[model samples]
Target chain A: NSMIDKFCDWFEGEFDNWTQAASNPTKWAHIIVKHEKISEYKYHTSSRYSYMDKPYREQTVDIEYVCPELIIVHNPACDIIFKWTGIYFEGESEPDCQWNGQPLDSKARLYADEYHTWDVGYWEGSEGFFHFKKNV
Target chain B: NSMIDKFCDWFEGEFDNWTQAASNPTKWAHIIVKHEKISEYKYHTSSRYSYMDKPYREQTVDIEYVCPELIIVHNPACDIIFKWTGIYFEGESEPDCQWNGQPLDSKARLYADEYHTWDVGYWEGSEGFFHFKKNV
Candidate 1:
């Protein structure tokens, strides 16, 4: 398979073992998009304020990749749009976790980082960080 | 012209006077999107930080209207997708702001509110609220 093809398969599906490195309460996120296509993608995330039994806060992400590396993310839930660049990092040993300095057991890692930008009708500017290995 | 046509015309263009009701040092924002076409509409936005001298944050929104009243927003920047319901609020006097209690003056108002749902993945749900009246 092509590099893009492998990347697509790695990207879609549930990322339940995500480790949060930021201040967000996001426990995990799932991304849904056509493997054959690079157009529209759906991102759904769940977070909790306290206990897991408590009602969790959720956010939906709407995004598309103009190119394999370049993507445009639009979150109507937050009324914010951000751009991102995606890259696959291949290493010999374990990869470094984005949230922590700990090593993650994986030969390959997918990193999608947001380009800094202010949004319309908003105050604060925000960015996104996605780092995970394909769940086997 | 029909309400949808008029609403479409009003949606596209620069919205420079949008005031921020949140935190952060946002000066202003500009929103640009195509009007006539619903499929794969490119939404672009840019805003300045504290000063124009600072780096401006920018984001691109990729969304399409499945129907006249429904839209699907995709953001590849964060790998998320969301559904939105559009409504045209017709009025004569000042229109009531959905976000805040302020009154906005415009011939009509366009509201794209997010529908609540649980996306494929782990456990959770999501929703959105983006309200604005065109400035005439």
Candidate 2:
């Protein structure tokens, strides 16, 4: 598969962290995420609270590749430029995005097997990632 | 507190199933749900794929009470009337809602510290609840 195709294939699917939530219920949540391809360059994703719990949020993600080493993520809260780091892709949250009433300085890491985000909270004393793994 | 007050306290929260997703990687998705109190009558919720993943979705939940045994949940895709079952609140999706291009048969359950849903997919072989526990 091509790089874009490979990335989308890896990115699209159902993902969650049920075991983590079950073990440390106080620190984590039971989440279910669904990412489906809409077209070659666009995808739609919906992540709900539980199996189908509300507080539901879904959006379309647009992907653009600029070079062999970089791809940009176009979405509501993220406009990230990811560069290949040999084994995985990494990027930092750009300005235009804010969370918790402040700008987000989230660290995004995409791998063949998992997508990890660090400092997603971006607030003092509250730092963690949603840690998404493909449910394939 | 009144039923409305108590209900808001229970309904408004951060719910997800990180552990279930983590354990049953093939059957679940990593989901993070945030439900906040916007007002006495409405609440805002955002359930993201992971900690802060994109393709994000967020909506406001409006609530109205008819009597002690009944309350209605209002949102974009749901307008359900929940009747108190003595121990907890139970509800079924109304006609305004549909899933998979058909009407929804989603069963909603609300408890003090946990919220569970059933037949959320409303399709054959995809029946299961997105079990959510409090992050408190």
Candidate 3:
């Protein structure tokens, strides 16, 4: 649970509010990278050559879930207008949320792929990223 | 005054509290680039050439004042984060407060060469060019 706790701490403190995930799910989509599976390897656990079954490649994009509830402190002074910072994972399908399929979310449905704007006599903008499972 | 009113409306709506530039004048830095004595044909106002007259050799950066008055709104949740989609230029030194001069008072601080993160986050990250003056 350390990884989960560390991740939540990062999401809450780095973001605004993260504990109440039910009210607000992940929102801030930060970085994106393609996931690649490496050939199976052997690990010497207890002096035995036990073949490692875990996926060797760890290239999944680390996205910040900015949904308000999931954050720790929902600062009234800030919002999504200032949260867009990410890269494009060219030629790869998006990561999945619930299903093990490509194209995790549609461009419109994904927070990183779509453009969000705030207006106050002028217009402000933010964008999201979409994860899709690549056919290749 | 019109710009102040618009900003004031945004402040109240954003923080749900009273925030005014008159009370909280943000300390900022400014960068001044002298116009280069270029060929006579370098005066076009096109976006491509908009950066003209600016020195390609030397640059100056300093601090000024950026007073962001909170903008007030009756119906806030509808557009709670509407006003802060981008950098806000608030004073003579503000290039629309885009990060080259003084940073947004509530969102950041002026460091030697970057706007360090404040309580809230920013979407622009470190993409654009802006110089803001800040005191240690």
Provide chain B's TM-score, model 3. 0.17
Q: Ten residues in a row with the worst lDDT in model 3 chain A?
A: A39-48
> Where is model 1 more than 4 Å wrong at Cα?
A1-5, A8-136, B1-7, B17-40, B49-56, B77-136
- Where does the lowest 10-residue lDDT sum fall in candidate 1 chain B? B93-102
Model 2 agreement with the true structure over B49-119: per-residue lDDT tens digits: 77566426565556888875778876434567788878998888776464323446668798998877665
Error of 2 at A13 (Å): 33
Instruction: List TM-score (chain A only) for every prediction.
Output: 0.32, 0.80, 0.17
lDDT for each residue of candidate 3 in B1-136, tens digit (9 for 90 to 100): 5643334322221010012222333532222222121112111010111225432222111111134543221111111121233465222221123221113322332222222223211453432333322222
Ranking by lDDT: 2, 1, 3
**N/CA/C clash count, model 2:** 30
Each prediction's Cα lDDT score?
0.32, 0.69, 0.23
DockQ of 1: 0.09
Number of the top lDDT candidate: 2
Between prediction 2 and prediction 3, the one with superior TM-score is 2
* lDDT score at residue B2, model 3, on the 0-100 scale: 60
